């Protein structure tokens, strides 16, 4: 049996999603797996999306301040993990920030900053501790979510791509695949090893925060690892000489003012890397380092505005600088 390399990519969940596979299985088996990957992404866009009016999440948000809503086990599990990271990060990551994000989401569309009293009012409706998850213990008991605070809105944008990458890895493994690179709008999962007959680590690129996105500034060699990066210049608009990016500091209600240009988290679960990258960007370097000591199975790489790069002990020897303007501190 010969090794063959496959890739497929589609526009879905508002971005470019690509999966690359190396396999010795019959091509028809790989094709079926990839068909299912992209069907999964279409289906889950309709479960998780905060943009669409017809999503499961949109329906849940429509019931804020009312009775508990039945959800599938998968959505319940994601919400549980999101609330876990909200608690651990002191709300730096907050999955109930929809009231505020929606004010800034219309700002992006109109290139305009939201009113101050409006933002202050919005922040009163973002207490994630008022998201109540309950699941009975008996056979076939339903999973439920209640949004106790009137007007509160879930927004899972900062954890959903991680969740989907993990679901895709589980699907690929179910199809007896063990070598893939999953890339959901830059949210990466490196499954197994690639092929050169030699097996090699995947070389995951991390962009210049101010780059045009084309070329990586750095590459990191990894196996069985997610790599997720949060940065200011990922998504922003400008008004009167000021840049407003998409990652909100829940204390201020404004885009976070932080001491790093990007943070990349390396974790065995992409769900976790995705939530932590957002939290760490909001928290800044020193507080991120404190948070990450609570997760010894995770590594991190910080790119500072002065182009210094600091990486934790578990990955620093795996980092190669490609753009010599950047310096890896050792
Ligand atoms: C199912 C799904 C469907 C999507 N559909 C569309 C679409 O139709 N059109 C489109 O343009 N984009 C779409 N997106 C992308 C969407 O805009 C997300 O906001 C984006 O994936 C997050 O970008 P990020 O990973 O770089 O940053 P992250 O840092 O991982 O997430 C930032 C996002 O999380 C929210 N957020 C901001 N601050 C915080 C905070 N402190 N804590 C927690 N959350 C915060 C906001 O939604 C923000 O956009 C979709 C994403 C998903 C997951
Ligand atoms: Mg994130
Ligand atoms: Mg993300
Ligand atoms: Na209010
Ligand atoms: Na800050």
């Amino acid at each position: 049996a010969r090794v063959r390399e496959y890739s497929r990519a589609e526009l879905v969940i508002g971005t470019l999603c690509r999966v690359r596979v190396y396999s010795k299985r019959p091509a028809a088996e790989v094709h079926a797996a990839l068909e299912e990957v992209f069907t999964l992404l279409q289906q889950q866009e309709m479960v998780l999306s905060a943009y669409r009016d017809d999503s499961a999440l949109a329906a849940l948000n429509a019931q804020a301040g009312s009775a508990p809503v039945v959800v599938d086990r998968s959505l319940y599990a994601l919400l549980e993990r999101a609330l876990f990271f909200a608690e651990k990060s002191g709300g730096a990551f907050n999955p109930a920030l929809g009231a505020v994000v929606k004010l800034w989401n219309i700002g992006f569309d109109r290139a305009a900053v939201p009113d101050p009293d409006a933002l202050k009012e919005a922040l009163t409706r973002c207490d994630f501790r008022q998201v109540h998850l309950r699941a009975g213990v008996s056979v076939g008991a339903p999973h439920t979510v209640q949004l106790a605070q009137a007007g509160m809105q879930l927004d899972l944008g900062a954890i959903a791509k991680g969740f989907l990458a993990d679901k895709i890895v589980q699907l690929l493994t179910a199809h007896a695949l063990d070598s893939a690179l999953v890339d959901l709008g830059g949210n990466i999962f490196a499954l197994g090893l690639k092929y050169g007959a030699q097996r090699l680590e995947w070389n995951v690129g991390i962009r210049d925060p101010h780059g045009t996105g084309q070329k990586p500034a750095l590459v990191v060699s990894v196996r069985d690892c997610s790599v997720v990066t949060s940065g200011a210049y990922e998504r922003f608009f400008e008004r009167d000489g000021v840049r407003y990016h998409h990652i909100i500091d829940p204390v201020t209600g404004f885009p976070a003012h932080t001491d790093v240009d990007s943070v990349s988290i390396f974790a065995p679960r992409s769900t976790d890397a995705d939530a932590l990258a957002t939290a760490c960007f909001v928290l800044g370097y020193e507080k991120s380092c404190a948070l990450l000591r609570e997760f010894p199975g995770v590594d991190a790489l910080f790119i500072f505005p002065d182009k210094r790069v600091r990486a934790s002990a578990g990955i620093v020897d795996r980092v190669r600088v490609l753009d010599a303007r950047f310096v890896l501190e050792r």
Side-chain angles (χ1 to χ4, degrees):
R2 289 184 299 100
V3 188
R4 303 178 181 87
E5 188 186 358
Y6 310 77
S7 190
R8 181 168 160 171
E10 307 182 11
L11 296 189
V12 58
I13 61 168
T15 188
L16 182 62
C17 294
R18 186 179 299 280
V19 181
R20 176 179 168 195
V21 174
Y22 288 89
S23 183
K24 295 175 170 183
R25 297 300 301 157
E29 292 189 27
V30 181
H31 165 67
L34 294 172
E35 191 61 35
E36 290 304 300
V37 165
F38 284 97
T39 297
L40 173 170
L41 286 167
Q42 297 282 318
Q43 296 173 341
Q44 293 296 123
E45 181 177 337
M46 302 302 307
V47 173
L48 297 175
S49 180
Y51 286 92
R52 310 170 71 89
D53 295 350
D54 48 345
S55 65
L57 196 67
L60 184 43
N61 283 341
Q63 299 292 328
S66 193
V69 173
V70 177
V71 299
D72 55 78
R73 185 183 300 272
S74 169
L75 178 53
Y76 185 93
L78 176 56
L79 290 173
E80 282 195 288
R81 195 62 171 172
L83 294 172
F84 171 81
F85 284 114
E87 292 282 359
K88 294 290 283 187
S89 71
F93 169 89
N94 182 339
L97 205 61
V100 167
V101 171
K102 290 304 187 189
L103 287 183
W104 287 99
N105 269 350
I106 61 179
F108 269 83
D109 310 329
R110 302 190 198 183
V113 177
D115 289 352
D117 288 321
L119 268 176
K120 215 187 193 188
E121 183 280 333
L123 276 166
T124 72
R125 297 180 283 119
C126 298
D127 181 7
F128 64 85
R129 299 169 296 174
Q130 290 255 74
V131 179
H132 299 310
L133 268 50
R134 304 182 194 95
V137 291
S138 67
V139 66
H143 293 266
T144 71
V145 181
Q146 182 174 39
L147 300 184
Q149 190 179 39
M152 78 185 303
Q153 304 289 270
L154 296 169
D155 175 348
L156 304 178
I159 194 172
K161 291 197 303 301
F163 170 80
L164 296 172
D166 285 341
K167 290 298 192 182
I168 289 169
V169 171
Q170 291 158 15
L171 179 62
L172 296 171
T173 298
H175 286 261
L177 306 175
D178 71 357
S179 173
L181 191 70
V182 175
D183 176 357
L184 307 187
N187 184 115
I188 305 302
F189 197 106
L191 175 62
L193 298 169
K194 67 175 184 177
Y195 292 74
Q198 189 175 28
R199 307 302 298 278
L200 305 169
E201 290 169 327
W202 296 97
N203 294 322
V204 175
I206 293 169
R207 62 171 275 178
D208 170 6
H210 288 91
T212 61
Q214 310 296 299
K215 41 166 176 181
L218 314 173
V219 289
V220 191
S221 299
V222 296
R223 170 183 54 78
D224 289 324
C225 187
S226 185
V227 185
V228 182
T229 301
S230 284
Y233 315 106
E234 289 184 292
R235 172 187 173 176
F236 61 85
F237 71 96
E238 298 191 351
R239 183 60 181 268
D240 296 328
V242 187
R243 288 192 169 192
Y244 302 90
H245 67 79
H246 71 316
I247 299 167
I248 300 301
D249 182 341
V251 169
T252 67
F254 271 74
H257 289 155
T258 184
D259 61 350
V260 297
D261 274 352
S262 68
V263 47
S264 300
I265 300 297
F266 299 73
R269 295 168 286 287
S270 196
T271 298
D272 296 357
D274 198 7
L276 286 167
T278 302
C280 284
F281 186 84
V282 175
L283 289 166
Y285 176 70
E286 291 188 5
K287 288 176 186 175
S288 285
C289 288
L291 174 65
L292 292 171
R293 297 187 319 200
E294 306 189 24
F295 300 94
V298 168
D299 280 288
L301 180 155
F302 299 92
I303 302 179
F304 292 88
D306 64 1
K307 304 198 179 66
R308 303 311 198 289
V309 180
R310 291 187 180 187
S312 56
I315 55 162
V316 63
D317 209 41
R318 300 167 179 275
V319 177
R320 174 167 168 245
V321 177
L322 302 175
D323 179 340
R325 296 175 304 152
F326 294 82
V327 169
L328 178 63
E329 294 186 350
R330 290 302 310 268

